[PDB]
Amino acid sequence: MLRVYHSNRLDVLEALMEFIVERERLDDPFEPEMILVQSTGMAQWLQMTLSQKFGIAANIDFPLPASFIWDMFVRVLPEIPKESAFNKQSMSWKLMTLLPQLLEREDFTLLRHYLTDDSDKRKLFQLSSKAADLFDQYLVYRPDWLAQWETGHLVEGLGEAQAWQAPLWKALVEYTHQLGQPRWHRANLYQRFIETLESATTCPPGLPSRVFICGISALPPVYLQALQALGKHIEIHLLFTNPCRYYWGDIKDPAYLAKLLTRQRRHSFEDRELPLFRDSENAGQLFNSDGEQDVGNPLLASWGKLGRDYIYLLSDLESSQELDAFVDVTPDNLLHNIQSDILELENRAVAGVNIEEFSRSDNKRPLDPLDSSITFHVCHSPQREVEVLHDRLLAMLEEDPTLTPRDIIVMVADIDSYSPFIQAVFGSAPADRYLPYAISDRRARQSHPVLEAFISLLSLPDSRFVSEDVLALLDVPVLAARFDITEEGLRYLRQWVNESGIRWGIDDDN
Amino acid sequence: AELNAKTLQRLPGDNWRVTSYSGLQQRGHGIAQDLMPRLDVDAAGVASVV
Amino acid sequence: EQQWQAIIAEGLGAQYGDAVPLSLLRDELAQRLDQERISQRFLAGPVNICTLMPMRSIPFKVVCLLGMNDGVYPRQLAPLGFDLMSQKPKRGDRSRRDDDRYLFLEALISAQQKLYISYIGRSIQDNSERFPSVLVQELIDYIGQSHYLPGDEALNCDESEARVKAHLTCLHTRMPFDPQNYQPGERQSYAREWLPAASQAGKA
Amino acid sequence: VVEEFDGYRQIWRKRGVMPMLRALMSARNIAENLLATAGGERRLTDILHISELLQEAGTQLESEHALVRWLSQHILEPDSNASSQQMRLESDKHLVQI
Amino acid sequence: QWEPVLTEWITAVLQAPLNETGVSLSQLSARNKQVEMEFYLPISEPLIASQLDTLIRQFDPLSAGCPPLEFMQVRGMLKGFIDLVFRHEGRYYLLDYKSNWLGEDSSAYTQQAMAAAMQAHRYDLQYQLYTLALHRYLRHRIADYDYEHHFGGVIYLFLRGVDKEHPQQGIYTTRPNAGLIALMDEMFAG
Amino acid sequence: AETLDPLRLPLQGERLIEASAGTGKTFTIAALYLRLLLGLGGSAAFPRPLTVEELLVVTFTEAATAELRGRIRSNIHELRIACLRETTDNPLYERLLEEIDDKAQAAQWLLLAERQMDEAAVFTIHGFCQRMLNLNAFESGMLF
């Protein structure tokens, strides 16, 4: 069965997962646990929490949702290759060959004028990559489009670009057939897998006992359909972090609103039912004629676009069971006040449309001056911003003894832009006034000099061979160590190259 | 007016850390473990294989 | 070597037999090196300093946000222009704008004890005014409208909102050696390195 | 003094460019004597801006000598249209503005 | 040109006898093998090199031969990767691969030389921590687990040392004492 | 030449505006932006109300760009608050409310416009050229 757990905080879902793992365990020790996460840090945090509670965390796999779905496809349906022939990487190299042949056709005339300029095949490769990305996105989200394009028909009421995209894909479906690669892909596999699972009398062998999905707040609808089909045979546990207690998604039709009102969420351990809406009788008043609900809190209304579609798709599941793990947030601080406003789906902001409401301010909640839960800081430069953040973190650490450096997190829009200032400010700090830090999500290319140097070596054929460039190549320590050149010798080499007359060029042939 | 900077009565501790056997034993590796999580760090210091 | 092998393996998987120049593989390698990122020390134990990653929401006691100026966040990505999905939106579609707009709410609700927000209000060169992101603006507007400072009951809603928004915004000095930093208050610095310069005690 | 400059070079190799300049200014009281001297505030602001620029540049360079070469190249031929190279405001105080 | 040799080099590894039992890699089925298992081990109390070395030296003669350990006090998680975990006749084992270039000749890959090689690189603490991890994992996963019944020992395989003619070369087998594992577990716990 | 009136300016075809020193051209730009958002002016008004993304503004420098963007956001917020309260002290907002037929629909439109302020199409010449080349790589022939 497919079970959906709702909780405002991730810690309660993690504790429920720990409880589920403690109650029932896999029969075979080699059988690895399955957890579905999209980010690596989430898997690291889950492993750390599980190892801290149970005392160890091993034999746990964290595959991506698409990889897990393809693995289930390979396991259930017969005669399926391990790796799909249709993927972002291979479709690029296939279209790179397919496009010049299709250039002659009228339908691709707009592409033809684009491919006339390039002479080193850069435009062809870039177009192939940009088309393979959109083909992958269509495989994921638009299977009916590709199913109609394969036959040769066009989708009614679509964009004009389809005119050049529909034949090409079809040619691809033919071209991969000529090479002998497997015909199967995700769009064809979806319906056959769903039918095979629906018509199965017993669970097919090789399936995992239980599957955990956690940390994922957005899933494609077809993946949700496949998970609903798979839940009947193997147990699936979805841990969804829901910021609002009540149902804040939109509705499709009033008939959908009725069966939505019928649905209720049971308590985790108290065995008490709870309605989805705060007021069942006045639930229809909230929704608009088009079907878009008006969210009570303005912040959740503005920033809740992503979770709204996900909760609406989760509510559509017929055979899914739902539970509530929500924890109340006492409004003892400003941040707690905002979180409680988000949780209880209420708007405390006063509009002031009335004269009495505009005249007085007693309607608002009283704020404490010493309270510093939410603070805003204005700086002049990123250097000053980090220099102020360091002192603020030191003050926060001095204020609270239980606070530790690991508990603090600092997020920046562009990590690469602020990494130099972060390093400089945190390193310039003395011994006593020191704070250990660690930087993540930085680009790998800028990590080591060797990576940058090699990239330059790849550009040897199209080079003018300036003397300063060749000397900067020697400035690298590993390269100088390879040719047994020291720094004292590097000085003599610099002087001799300066006074000898070497300006540019390696030989007359260059 | 007189100007005096604040002092830190408590010093933050770097005792808590997540480590591996290679980082605990082999100091020379440096950040080699960060670049490749599954790099064979047991063997280092290549020799002449001309 | 691994990236090079992966590129050439993905090329050979499609059985491409035509000649390939060096510049193509070079550019492919240079792009893939930029795409890859390192996150092995996310929870090592020191303070975590990284970018906002979608779908990653972990509870932390102190959550700080830097670089929230207008035009920097939310990060913007434009469609190709020939993407049929972008022309007709549908439920379940994912855009980077909505991803960042929901990451901001995730970071708001993830803060257990303290939330910190910083942005560049004034330009260091021309001393000209700069504005924050729209999300931080909506947040501070909601905070000002929702709450009132003690002793402001007599005043109207707009004056109380303005007074509350002024109470939470802290404008720091332009230079680290400014004496205003080394005074008893909320923004007293822990760096005694600039204390001698501030005391203006020196020989010409 | 040679040992002191060797320690400065070690700090440069380990922590970075600006962490070395910070220690160099703190050990010899450069900022204090500059602010004490008439007109030294402009010089101190320029030094700090150049330190920030040197950090930003050395972040994206292969070797340490490459940073010295980059600084010398920027010094030999300067760009006035670049917004980053524009000189910052000398002081935030209320003074006669030219 | 490395094709004809390496293939043979693979076969001698698959058809080699790991221990007294005579179990071989080729015999093992796909369901009985686990490759590259990752484990996290929590350390509740600070770990001191001196006390750990004092505890380890008495139980293990290899550690008694080695010089004392030196490392900073650590408190947190321990990350580890295991090359191969396989069960034979109801008893679980541990297998690690070592691609280190010990010597240029076969005599450098003998058992006596492999002992000194293990001593030099301090792989003893490595396999001891791996045994602690595997013991905790088998205790957690298996409802009825006994260390004496379900543990088979540690196997280190030097790929270059492996030779078809000489069975002893290229393999190092050693099972830690149960009391040492229990004391290490108690030390890591509290 | 004719004395300019922001409320009565016909937003059709090509119009040239001369703003002398001290006249405050930014105020007129903001008033015209609000008119284009709300479609006010009758015959002088645009045939259909335009969204924030559709409106295009070109500025000389980055600082002027940020200043105009922030001022447009502030004016949108103030006009929305005035439409909600239906009573404003500013004369320009008062004339706008006079021209507005329905204040609730205008307030909803202004709320949507304020929520779409980060996607405002206010750029410089170089940024506009770069974005137009990127969005139309096929027609222009530029690399991706």
Ligand SMILES: [Mg+2]
């Ligand atoms: Mg190994």
